[PDB]
């Protein structure tokens, strides 16, 4: 399976995000990715403004032992539709 998780800061998620995703900001991801994605084998697609929070989330998630995290891109570059908070 997979999940789309925006990891930018929560105030920036609300501006506009890829449709049908959830938001777990980089700041909060540690406390909560385990609740949103309880099985590590699941495919975690991460994005944000400009990829950073995703690249960073990818490091800590690999360390937490998720083996299938992928930076989908950044908000802009991702060709998928978007909706606003």
Curated annotation (Swiss-Prot):
Induction line: By heat, ethanol, osmotic shock and infection by filamentous bacteriophages. Expression is positively regulated by cyclic AMP-cAMP receptor protein (cAMP-CRP). Expressed at higher levels during growth on glycerol, acetate or proline as carbon source relative to expression during growth on glucose.
Compartmental location: Periplasm
A single Gene Ontology CC term: outer membrane-bounded periplasmic space
EC numbers, comma separated: 2.8.1.1
Activity regulation description: Inhibited by thiosulfate above 100 mM, particularly at low cyanide concentrations (<5 mM). Inhibited by sodium sulfate or sodium chloride at 0.25 M which gives around 50% inhibition of rhodanese activity. Addition of sodium phosphate at the same concentration results in about 65% inhibition. Sulfite strongly inhibits PspE activity (1 mM sodium sulfite resulted in more than 50% inhibition of rhodanese activity).
Leading EC class: transferase
Quaternary structure (record): Monomer.
UniProt name for this protein: Thiosulfate sulfurtransferase PspE
UniProt source species: Escherichia coli (strain K12)
Gene: pspE
Full protein segment contained here: 20 to 104 of 104
